Ligand binder design. Structure first.
Ligand SMILES: [Li+]
Ligand SMILES: [Li+]
Ligand SMILES: [Li+]
Ligand SMILES: [Li+]
Ligand SMILES: [Li+]
Ligand SMILES: [Li+]
Ligand SMILES: [Li+]
Ligand SMILES: [Li+]
Ligand SMILES: [Li+]
Ligand SMILES: [Li+]
Ligand SMILES: [Li+]
Ligand SMILES: [Li+]
Ligand SMILES: [Li+]
Ligand SMILES: [Li+]
Ligand SMILES: [Li+]
Ligand SMILES: [Mn+2]
Ligand SMILES: [Mn+2]
Ligand SMILES: [Mn+2]
Ligand SMILES: [Mn+2]
Ligand SMILES: [Mn+2]
Ligand SMILES: [Mn+2]
Ligand SMILES: [Mn+2]
Ligand SMILES: [Mn+2]
Ligand SMILES: [Mn+2]
Ligand SMILES: [Mn+2]
Ligand SMILES: [Mn+2]
Ligand SMILES: [Mn+2]
Ligand SMILES: [O]
Ligand SMILES: [O]
Ligand SMILES: [O]
Ligand SMILES: [O]
Ligand SMILES: [O]
Ligand SMILES: [O]
Ligand SMILES: [O]
Ligand SMILES: [O]
Ligand SMILES: [O]
Ligand SMILES: [O]
Ligand SMILES: [O]
Ligand SMILES: [O]
Ligand SMILES: [O]
Ligand SMILES: [O]
Ligand SMILES: [O]
Ligand SMILES: [O]
Ligand SMILES: [O]
Ligand SMILES: [O]
Lengths: 302, 302, 302, 302, 302, 302
């Protein structure tokens, strides 16, 4: 079972203005083959399908727990996309938008028109070419070593996509999200590498980094490492998965320092609200009446 | 962000036999168009994309919270499929399997060979025809009423699929899961119906049930209604989404009785472990050495 | 624009038994790559996209008119599938079905479970492997000769699929439909062949038949040829497309006799009603109340 | 069976010049998930699959007839796309185009290059991201109420897409088509809402409009309402489907006025011919010889 | 550029019976995600896309050459499927087949009806669920180490699928092919492992075997190891790719013995001819006349 | 089996600078429905699946041999795309690229962002809309005439796509590749036309050219015809497929001159190396160390 906390894993800054094509690129990191939907769903299904949940508990704890962290990663990437697509972030009501004036004319020419037609200028479950995420992006073989090898690869392929998208987008919201997730994915690759070392004797962490560029070269990632985030494997559970430190121990590939298991989630930051976009009819063409209905619900609870 | 509890939402019975084609049918309820992946991802993305998270808070709480419940539903359906595919449920080691003896011969003739080739006799992210789940199964328009109308329909379509699959197999593991999720889906349809009533004045819950058959006629669903579980909307959050009762109030469609919000998840049941299946090399061809490695990780003194 | 006549293009026989796997095979002829959805949508879009609708009018008339015939062919193939899936053909009410008795148990083991889960034991927009029909099955290049060459090939590929499916099932409903559509497809291939001859001088009809087997060797096709139906190109329009005989003239490939345009559709046969299937909740679990509602709508006096 | 009339459901104006990206956006309304292919194919297959064609005749008439209207809607949207893609609308011959001069250079940079590579600058069976229409966009459950609920949703989701595309495209051809189809889809949603009211007692039409914006705010739609088109359900059949007025009666959601069944199709407008585009080789590189062949066909018919 | 030799990479045994469902399983090894189409197209595109073809030549030679071997592997797997589907292997003519006798009746009930409808009882470009091979099964990142890590994983995933299919069928044609390709895939995994060791210092070959079962335990693989074939990396080029031994050197993972480059292909075996299948119209319904045409082409004197 | 020669079928010129959208258009010719992957895989699978390999040998030789030529065509088109995507063609090391400077900013706005995210600025297995190539683009019926008719169509449809892309792209690398492949595809269509003439008596080559434009109007193609390349069917085999001249004889459709079989491949031109692109991490972020590793491999081979 799962619980939800209404916080992003990190706070995000506010864009100056909408950037459709940046959003379209960041979609690769959400619904593309090596996006956060893929790391999420790989580890989630592997955790369901895991054989030897007690006999191989340290490894089950690892996969089950990282799966849970990836839920917050799809959330964070979606928030980044939504921030880039928001007309009026935080503004509950805009008046005077006239559909006859072609208020979405810009969207005719952007890469991803689906963001504005199918979405209400919001994230979709797709990659940078509009390709919808698919379940064949999941590998769940039941063989622990084969799955872990897959997962080590998956994390460094995902890293490579994050680096490339970072190099496309100058928006601070994207750069902050990517810098943070470069550090988190670095932890995951290190953890799966340590798991493989324990099971096979092959020194997988010595292959890192892939590509051969340090996260320290990405300023936003460097800041998060200066805060210690590359050391941290958070236990995203009230009471379970207490044996993470049997694998998540020893040296960090980033700097050689001792890694640590942190009890509980980080404190994070606020969730994002894109506000009213009347031309998208989102959350309504003119939401004033619906806001009054919601206000009255609180009154009649008395 | 999210947390995980290492428990299924309910206790499931022990499978007494492998039933591949029953598993293949139950896959519709996991990765088909109207399976639990679809209710999950619809509500998850709508929750990310929600505009007016404070101004329309009761409705945000509702979608965000139901999304979180659906995480446990994909888990429960996957455990059911894994139960139907398990050769040696709960058993850490089977010896003496020889690939040359054709130990997967039965799998040649089953509907879903992928369960045995791609999976290690485990669940996959697909429906009853082998179709992998896809992101175009998600509707996230940004318009609150349009989304809620979609979701009401989605829940009753999903219910229809559950009823049809129930009629295909008398397997007790599958029927236990379906009975429970008929009740839970009944709550979700009722909740979206109540949300629509509040926003539009249209008495959507008076359309229920769809199809025109009562859950009380399904013995395994009646079991859970007899415990009161159709009344309960569980708040799957430590501290957030506290305004569910502004919508989740008034009469149950099942029996006219007053519905209630329950703070926190139900107690749950243990997770499922399919055990060793040597022919699937899962978790290893012979996992004895890996089990010894895992045991030695605990020798870590202190 | 289009009009509809509530009749199948031919009378079909009453199914005597459900035959799921025969239905699954016949789906190739509906939603597979070379099924009736493909001939329909190819000619429909080519007709929309046609350049020179006046300057090349005989060829426009041909494609526009054959497209219209193919609407009745998807209808006929769907009726055939529905006949093979019908539990109680023509019967408005069956009572006493109990879901707990596993009334869909047989469907667990059939090839196409989607017919029973997604469909209410009815046709779906897919082929013999469950693959949903897709728009990339359409070729609409704007170049008349290239399109016509495509269409000649399409018809003989479709014929090949019909012959193979015919050889898979001796079901009389399926064979009646296939015999008729072998004849109709023979007309379409001949017509596109004659169109190519007129534009290029290449004697395309001399390539027929493909494969090298005569329709006269298929008893159910010979039935319709014995009535003269291989001669007939029906003009499915009240007033338009009057120049078909500029192309549809000269010898039939079947027997060398003169072909003719028939103004208007053939008489047809009744539509098919699969009746009540309570286990599929179709048209309702118990439709008695809905039938009473419908009856009362007629009480509307005047 | 079906018949064809060589008229669009409304006349369309002529664009000043080609607008590739407008065409690419309008594709959502043709081959996207909530485009006219989807309303067409949903109602078409539901009509084939309908159980109780006599006992539930008013509802069968409704679905069967609306399906027929949607055939003219795919035609109208395709004509709109073709109008936006036409280089030389109405012009049968352009001379002097040299492929070596890069006459399609502009198409290198447009959103939808397939329009110019796979199509001969013509419509394709796809949406606004190039995604080909697929049969999984059809819902045909066999359960009348479930299907009608689906269809009510489908029409208002389609409306939402039409409004968004309208807000992207200032081209009169697009605005006229969309204004007209907003009114027609308004009729369909009202009709399915009235059908649900009759079967369930739930006042579905009171939910309209969705989104909460009146068609009267869209100038082209307002004109069509001033002509009475929101009242009209046309009977697209010579002799069938005569019981539409048992459901299609009472108040219009637009203005409260009495709705009416119109015997027969509207008179409509001319079909569209994009003319010659030599760089697309459409209908031929230089069609002069083919036009002479067609002329001679009329001579030799004497 | 490429050349072709009209020989399979090994001699295969004569099939003694048709086995449709065995063919359907073996399709996973052809067009599934981890089939030979995937190893082929991965290495082929990586070879095209390779940066540093001179500066990193040993690694280019390796990928370019293994790609070429995989061409013969798709050929070998297709021949195996065709053997399992052949009615009359090696026989040019069967007379007396009558379509009306339902000669394809068995095919109604097999898993893969497409083999008999779309194919003429022959291989298709698809996996074990009928899923057509797709280009998203290719990973071509341009980063040498990332690609090589991918390829190491790909080979051991492919091996896992081969082992599972081997366990599904005791058909001798299938098992001969699988035994040989277990050996060949073992060479490829070892070679990519050695390439990774050279570039990273990580002892990837020490992870082998994955799964933890030796090829020597599969009798048909041991057959080929007993001939020495696990030592051999064949250079499939007349004059190019001469630096393979810079990487393909040192110990075999199978037995610790020294591996070698073999200049040129192995001798091979004859190609397979499934013979006439009249019910499939393959190569014609009755090919006697075509055989006479072919014979007469040789009468060409000189 | 197959062999590889490290030469392109023709030399290609060097672009002045990267042209992403030209690359995206040329992708249609690689992985689109009528691209070189399709001609390749059609003929390859038809050759595997061919019945009567001896009795119909001239036709088997033709398909098997043309399949082999198409391998070099996917190679040539990929080289063209890679040339258009290369930042630094031929340059082994660029220093000073800083990811923090947004060095991929241009790629945010191009049509095909996947080239820069999933690819390392390299070719992908997809068409001009990002659609990945799929195995349903292959037709392998087992019926010789039906397949040959398909293949004649396939070649002229492919030609049409090549002409359209030529008209979009002024880059010499694209124009040279397309001019050459127009001539080669002209040979293939002529050859399949001659095969059909021999088997059927229908004068298929008289339909050529399709579209009705001569290759002589494309300057690059004209040059290759002036060199005689339209006459040449190269035998891409050491010793096999020696009966091509039984079909490949008589008049060329281009100019009436006698066609010829050439023993062996053409001499071709150099393969292409895109060089270092540090922002793509291709072949490494900074490949200096890897180049030193490769150098040392040659030293330690002594
Ligand atoms: Li911006
Ligand atoms: Li640090
Ligand atoms: Li625990
Ligand atoms: Li519970
Ligand atoms: Li239990
Ligand atoms: Li008839
Ligand atoms: Li009948
Ligand atoms: Li314009
Ligand atoms: Li009005
Ligand atoms: Li009637
Ligand atoms: Li060999
Ligand atoms: Li043999
Ligand atoms: Li350029
Ligand atoms: Li010449
Ligand atoms: Li030979
Ligand atoms: Mn992540
Ligand atoms: Mn991760
Ligand atoms: Mn659920
Ligand atoms: Mn639910
Ligand atoms: Mn037809
Ligand atoms: Mn036809
Ligand atoms: Mn419509
Ligand atoms: Mn409509
Ligand atoms: Mn291989
Ligand atoms: Mn391999
Ligand atoms: Mn080619
Ligand atoms: Mn070719
Ligand atoms: O991740
Ligand atoms: O991540
Ligand atoms: O991550
Ligand atoms: O759900
Ligand atoms: O559910
Ligand atoms: O649910
Ligand atoms: O057709
Ligand atoms: O047909
Ligand atoms: O047809
Ligand atoms: O529609
Ligand atoms: O519409
Ligand atoms: O509509
Ligand atoms: O492979
Ligand atoms: O392989
Ligand atoms: O392999
Ligand atoms: O080709
Ligand atoms: O080509
Ligand atoms: O070609």
């Amino acid at each position: 079972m799962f619980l939800r906390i209404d916080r992003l894993q990190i706070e995000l800054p506010m864009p100056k203005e909408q950037d459709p094509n940046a959003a379209a690129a960041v979609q690769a990191l959400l619904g593309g083959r090596f996006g956060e939907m893929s790391t999420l769903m790989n580890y989630m299904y592997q955790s369901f399908n895991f054989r030897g949940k007690k006999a191989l508990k340290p490894y089950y704890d690892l996969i089950a727990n990282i799966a849970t962290e990836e839920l917050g990663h799809i959330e964070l990437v979606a928030a980044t996309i939504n921030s880039l697509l928001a007309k009026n972030p935080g503004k509950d009501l805009e008046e005077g938008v006239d559909p006859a004036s072609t208020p979405l004319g810009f969207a005719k020419d952007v890469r991803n028109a689906a963001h504005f037609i199918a979405g209400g200028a919001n994230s979709l479950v797709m990659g940078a070419m509009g390709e919808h995420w698919n379940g064949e992006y999941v590998f769940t073989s039941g063989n622990l070593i084969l799955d872990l090898l897959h997962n080590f690869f998956l994390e460094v392929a995902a890293r490579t996509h994050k680096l490339r998208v970072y190099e496309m987008t100058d928006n601070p919201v994207a750069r902050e999200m990517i810098g943070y997730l470069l550090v988190r994915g670095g932890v995951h690759a290190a953890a799966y590498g340590k798991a493989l070392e324990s099971l096979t004797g092959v020194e997988m962490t010595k292959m890192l980094p892939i590509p051969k560029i340090d996260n320290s070269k990405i300023p936003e990632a460097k800041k998060y490492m200066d805060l210690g985030f590359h050391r941290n494997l958070y236990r995203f559970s009230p009471e379970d998965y207490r044996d993470l430190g049997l694998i998540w121990k020893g040296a960090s590939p980033e700097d050689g320092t001792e890694v640590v298991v942190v009890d509980g989630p980080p404190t994070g930051g606020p969730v994002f609200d894109a506000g009213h976009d009347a031309a998208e009819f989102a959350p309504e063409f003119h939401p004033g009446e619906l806001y009054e209905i919601a206000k009255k619900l609180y009154e009649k609870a008395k």
